[PDB]
Design a protein around this nucleic acid. Sequence first.
RNA 1: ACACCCAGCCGC
Lengths: 140, 49, 48, 148, 240, 64, 96, 44, 545, 79, 257, 147, 34, 115
Amino acid sequence: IFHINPRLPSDLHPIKVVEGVKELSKKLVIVNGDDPLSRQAQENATLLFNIHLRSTLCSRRMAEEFRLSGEAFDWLLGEIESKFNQAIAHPGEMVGALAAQSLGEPATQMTLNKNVTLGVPRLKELINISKKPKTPSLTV
Amino acid sequence: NGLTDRDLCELNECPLDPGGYFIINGSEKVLIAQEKMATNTVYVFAKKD
Amino acid sequence: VSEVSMIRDIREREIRIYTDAGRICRPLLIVEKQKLLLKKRHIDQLKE
Amino acid sequence: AGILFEDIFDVKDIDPEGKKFDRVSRLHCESESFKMDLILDVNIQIYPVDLGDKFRLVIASTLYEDGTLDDGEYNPTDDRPSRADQFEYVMYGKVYRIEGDETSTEAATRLSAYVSYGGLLMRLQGDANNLHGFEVDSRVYLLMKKLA
Amino acid sequence: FASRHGQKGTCGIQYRQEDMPFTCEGITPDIIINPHAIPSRMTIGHLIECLQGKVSANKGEIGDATPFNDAVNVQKISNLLSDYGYHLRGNEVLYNGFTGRKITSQIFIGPTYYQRLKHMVDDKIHSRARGPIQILNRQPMEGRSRDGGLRFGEMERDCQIAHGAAQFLRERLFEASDPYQVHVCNLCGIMAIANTRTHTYECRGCRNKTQISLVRMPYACKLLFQELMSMSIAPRMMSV
Amino acid sequence: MIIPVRCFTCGKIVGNKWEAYLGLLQAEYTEGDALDALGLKRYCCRRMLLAHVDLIEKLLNYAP
Amino acid sequence: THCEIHPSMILGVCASIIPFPDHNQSPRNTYQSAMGKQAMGVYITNFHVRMDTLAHVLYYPQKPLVTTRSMEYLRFRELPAGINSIVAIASYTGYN
Amino acid sequence: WGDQQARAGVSQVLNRLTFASTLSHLRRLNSPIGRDGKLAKPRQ
Amino acid sequence: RVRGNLMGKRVDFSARTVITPDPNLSIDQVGVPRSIAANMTFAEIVTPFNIDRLQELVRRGNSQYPGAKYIIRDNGDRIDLRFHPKPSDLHLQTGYKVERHMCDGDIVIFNRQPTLHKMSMMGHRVRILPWSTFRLNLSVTTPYNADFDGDEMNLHLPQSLETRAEIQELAMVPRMIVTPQSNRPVMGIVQDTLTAVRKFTKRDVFLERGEVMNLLMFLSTWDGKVPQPAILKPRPLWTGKQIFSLIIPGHINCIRTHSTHPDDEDSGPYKHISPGDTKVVVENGELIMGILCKKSLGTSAGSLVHISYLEMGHDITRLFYSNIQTVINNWLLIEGHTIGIGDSIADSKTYQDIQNTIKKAKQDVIEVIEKAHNNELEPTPGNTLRQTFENQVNRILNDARDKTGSSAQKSLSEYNNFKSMVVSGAKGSKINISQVIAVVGQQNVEGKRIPFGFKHRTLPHFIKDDYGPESRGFVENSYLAGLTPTEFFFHAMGGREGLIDTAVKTAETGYIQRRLIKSMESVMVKYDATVRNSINQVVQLRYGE
Amino acid sequence: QKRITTPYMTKYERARVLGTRALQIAMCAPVMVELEGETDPLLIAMKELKARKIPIIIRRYLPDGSYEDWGVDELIISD
Amino acid sequence: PYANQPTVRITELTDENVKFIIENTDLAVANSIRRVFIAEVPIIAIDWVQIDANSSVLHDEFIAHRLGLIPLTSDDIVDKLQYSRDCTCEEFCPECSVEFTLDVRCNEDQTRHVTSRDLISNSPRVIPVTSDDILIVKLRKGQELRLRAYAKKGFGKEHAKWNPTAGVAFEYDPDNALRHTVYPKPEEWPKSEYSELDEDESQAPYDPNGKPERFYYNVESCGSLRPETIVLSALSGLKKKLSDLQTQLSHEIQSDV
Amino acid sequence: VSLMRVLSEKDVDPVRTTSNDIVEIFTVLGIEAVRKALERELYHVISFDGSYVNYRHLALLCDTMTCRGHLMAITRHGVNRQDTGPLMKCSFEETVDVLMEAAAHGESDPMKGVSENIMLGQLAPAGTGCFDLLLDAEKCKYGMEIP
Amino acid sequence: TCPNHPDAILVEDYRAGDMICPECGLVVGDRVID
Amino acid sequence: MNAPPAFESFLLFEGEKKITINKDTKVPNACLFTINKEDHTLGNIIKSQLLKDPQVLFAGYKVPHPLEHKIIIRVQTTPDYSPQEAFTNAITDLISELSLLEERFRVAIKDKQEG
RNA sequence: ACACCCAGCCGC
Ligand SMILES: [Mg+2]
Ligand SMILES: [Zn+2]
Ligand SMILES: [Zn+2]
Ligand SMILES: [Zn+2]
Ligand SMILES: [Zn+2]
């Protein structure tokens, strides 16, 4: 969008990248509030995404392979914020019925009945607790 | 039974009609052959439970 | 009569001769020392 | 003059990996003056080429030889002449990649430009001193005419 | 319309003869079916029947399609079709009916037996707008023959919870099926006596005549609770 | 039930060509030559005459 | 000791009218067998003097131009159930 | 098929829709295995 | 009562009709017959700036579609219009309710049973077309799991603006393209449009000026400027990639690989200049190289239409679907697509190779039976001798079938339409090609081979205890070659097994669906983002952790 | 300050707020935005949402009984 | 005026074939001329059947449908009649109609064939074309068929009974030089009738600077019109449609600015 | 399956010996362990078709079956036994028996689920039904008053 | 039983489901039964 | 039940217009011609005749739906020659084409019939 | 003009 040629040197100070990714990491929130439990839950809720964000937007990669400019990096931070805030699950959503249908719709496509059982009978044998399985097995 | 095609046409019945079906109340009723295990013969089955 | 079943159980010595309603049958040609008994005379007689 | 690159070439191969398409042939060419390696997809149906043929390439910013950018729209009602009138086979496309032998310390020595003619590709590989007109995501024109 | 190899299909469009494609001899297709009908259904018998149909119509006889016959190989049918001036394997150059241009893919054409099935669309089309209702519960009746209403079933309900459309789900199950209103005592949650003419409202039992709640509720749920109170179960409709 | 007046595909008149076709079958000609004696060049009309059943003759047997 | 008279007699009635069934897939042979009972045509010759509750009568039944030799006996040459259509297996407009 | 718990659907109205339908309905058989039962073996 | 008349009740204002395709409609549109439109009504409330239209609708009456039906005044009394030819009561004022006929632009819910998931019930906009069928867009049939072999399909019409708004903002086709089932677009380009775009984006396809201006007529989201041709001087020609670049919406950026992409091409010298255009590397607005297929344009996760939905919203993706299905179809008017006998024929060398491979497989099976008969073939650990011998035979026959399938599909030309429909991903697979051209192969009943239904043999045409590749069931012929009767019967058993599977599995999976939903149907996301059930118990602290 | 909810107007909030506004405008409520040629109340509802001038406040029930009153004007719309 | 100059030649001219070649014109012009052959040429065919009595084995709609497909001679009379929706008549008048009466009755033991010769027309300029006779219904003893029919003037767009042609064949560029169809294997494809290449070659070499200006026709008459008159009325009808479009756009431009 | 005795055996890995029997994982290893095992088995069952189901629906299903300490069957014997409410539990299955239990024990259904609100026709607490729309008069006095 | 129209018979519409007046079109009784 | 009248494909009822002109505002000097109650027969020839005109920059036609009976012809010319004039020139050119072809065909009939 | 019971058939 910003017509960045990956041959010329950029004008992006890497400490601005570091404070930018730190500021973006702080600003996107899933568990809000200021409590020793709230900070822990917020850090754990976005831990994997924060590691991926720090890995992808690191100073060395962006100064070696991406070569973004300051305006491009600011737009990148804003767009990451916008997409993450759009991707948060909306309150009121019936994730239960949605989960049940999104599980049972991959049940009308596989077949029925040196391997253990698998398919619709395995699904029926899993969601029932099935005190007498047909082929129970270990993996030692 | 044993009627020629001309006599069948004179009787307002199709000569190519296969027959083998009863008429009850005017409805054309047919019996489908049921099927069962054969009588008077011994079987040995292995009930797996 | 022509519809009668005639089975010999070789390994268990049983000559079941079931003659009852309900058995299902097909007409098949008879092979007699690797030659059909259906010669040309039967076909020529059936063609008329 | 708005000419990025200008040199003649010689064909060595026609279908090194087989004739993958019926109407497009992937020429493998080499130069004799600037030592330029080249792989170019050519519409063989409307412009037949053979082994040992000699032909001249101009890679240009515009056909208009005046510096006025055409902005890439098809307008056939243009009376003022163009470079394409002097050549028998012209083309158009976006450049999409400038690879090279650059290292973290050492600068560029050999550069290769990948150019996309709406599907028909080319790689122009050679010395870095004469590919300075190429910059990524820019519109270039291919010029061709056969020589005896 | 069904071919003799399990190639089902409803008619999707009807184009006139000037819109059909055509051969070099003016042959337009009576029926056009997609190639996607037969790369996954294995019905090569359809293609062989079409080839033998071209051969039979050109030759002047009824072709043979006896199963397990070894004199009817596809190469023999192709060689016979070669003798009548057509392509070896079925294909024929068709021209586009609209623009008159040649199609640069030679279309496989020929005679093929098709059958019209009992299922016509005028015998299936059906619609309702506040028609007749049943006696027992005041829901719309069952089936096209009675101007009845489609079931919005248990699975339809479930996917409407999945969408999250509360009001649409309510409109299908309350407003568009069986709207009803009842009068309920406030102390005991029991259906009371209502006099809409003289406006004299009384809960027989409690001897309450002062406060009565109006409840909008389906007729089927009213019948449910009345059958519960027939079996000595009292669903108390306590609105507090 | 009866021979169509027109071929479905092209539109050539084939209503008048049934009876004579039967005559050419009564005059010990092959069906292909019988079709070629009628000018039915395209195989649509050959489909019409070759694969038709005269069920109206069956229907005429019954009393009116 | 014995010999099949002709193996195409393993097929039934509505599967016998299938041309080249040995080249099809078995589910599609099953489907054609199921819908052959639903194909309309001249169902009986005395349909004028029989008034059934439902009846579909086709104007121009045509004997199949590609016939199975077994349905010489099913009277399908005399009471057919379809028309030989000029069929082009093509993608024309997206309506098929 | 009884004097009103007996077998049901033994007799059907003949399927006058086409000649093949009539023949296939007259030459039909029927198994007594409970049709709603979620079995696998006898149907093969 | 509870299941059949409280959870699921018959509804008024519902329609059911056989469905037929319509490639000239958008994905959010459904065609409605005129009788359904005239019968089903929407109750509009007379606002002070629509009397000029509702008066005309009432004056047209119930026999002049698009007209109107019953008028509801403020009292709640329903004047009928079909039956009342008097001029006094036709007057409308503010506050009245006119039950007008359904017209173009009315939001409807459009549903197909079985209603397996949330994509089986989406909302459309009504377009009135003059025949008796519901006409869909083609790509809409993939979430419905529909086709047009006789599928009937249901119509529901809201009559309250809050319900119409809820369908318009929650259950539209474009809004509900990407499923949360698999975070992939459940809609996608299918059938002809998919198998022609593979033809359209190949390198060899060039278009003259006339057909370019014919195709760009069908591009709804076109800026109006004809782009510069790829080739100018001998003749102005446009490649198909430029036309599809005009179809590509906004400025999306995706990288996909074609189905026939070589695996070692990444290690080759021509890593970023494909010799077969097998890398779809679509740049800032333009598809610079690549051949489009199921993997790049279909329903796969991370595909191009998924990128379009994730970047440009949902209305632009609607226009993207419509533009693809409108341009590619009208190019397929020119190119055309067929299939025939000549697409199932290989040359004599390929048939000889298949026959030699099958003869070698038969000889090796006879050899391993002879080896197993004379106390050799010591069993593999964990398996009996019979299972070991059966596994050996199955492995030999499976390798033979795979080898002859590779030999058959190796000899396909470029113009073979079976290949052109498999590599696009439109319909079929390589197994279909191997079954049509090479041998059909081993056919199994309940996993094992054909069981000894008779005494020690499978058919009465075989000797007793014959474990060869002819008695226990293995087709030595193609579909086009024709099955000899024994393997015709074995094919009937093989097809019957899948028929029993498809006829029994529904009755189990519908019960699994019902128990799974009724177990967790009140489990929602409350406003503190804690996922809780009906009686207010925390199931998860955050949805999906 | 006692406002522990998401500061983003959910899609269900959008659906029902547009529905209520459209029904109210159909029942002759005053329109808070200029009109330049729409008849259907839904289009007016979308225009009022985009103008953020709707007269609607929504009450969100936390799963303990406590409520939170939000203004649609002070929420963040999805476009 | 940027319009070229097409020319015609006629190969052979029978009573049913008017095979002609058009040179120096666009593809679209030739295709639209073919479509006007199929569709936009008016002839006369029966469209209003009134069954007085029908005791035959064929029902009334079947008899009416087979009567509609019977061709009628319309060599000059179709150009002077009007459309029944474009006349001042109440329902039907002899200015735009022809009357037909059929009063056949069988009272013999042998079967009676109700051929097209038994349709007694009113104006002796239209007639069934076989006046080899188009049979309508077979009758046995005691069966009658009394009916009155009215035949209008209509286009082939409205119904296929007004289609005058019988499968027009339109072929351009027979030796496949201009690559508009690509043969996967060219040598196995048969050479067409109008082919200039020998048996050894398969297709003509590719012509880059080439457009198709050669169009071969096989317009075949069903019988309603002479094969001269189908083309000579199709060109007139296409000219009339273009003139109607011209005057409508002139009226639009007049009331524009 | 003799999972605990197999784990106790010398020279087998005691940290990774996982079986596919749900109830023995529950009785030996805990409730979070059987939740993780039920996760992994439900992910393994959707593997041969190649279709990927997102890891936020499997987790929700496993947390619903492993919420109440004892492992919860998806049958009447586990969904009707948790103390939700009589009107959902009679809408699932065993209708008249649950209604007898509620009548005999005097159960009070708090109407807090979706199925109860559906069957009595009132506005269900669905995605758009968990609200309370209010009318404010401070914002309402603004705007242009055309009608 | 139509208001404003004494002594008026009501056409019972078993298709539309109403009881309807042949002078003004009012409806007495919101739905019909059977 | 929902079949249109067979004459609706080529007949105008009272009220609808045969041809309309809509100036297109995406690009300057372009027009849309919405010709009603007609089919590809005029669309193809008008498109080709406008394509032959060297001062026409774009000339295309579409049929929006086969079950409907509208054709939309979009034309864009140079800013020297109005698109309505281009359409007028194309129609009168096709009139000249058809008239000259009719005269030559009549001469061909006379020459073949005379001997 | 129904209400049960039974059968057959359609789409997945
Ligand atoms: Mg279907
Ligand atoms: Zn009380
Ligand atoms: Zn014909
Ligand atoms: Zn008149
Ligand atoms: Zn009244």
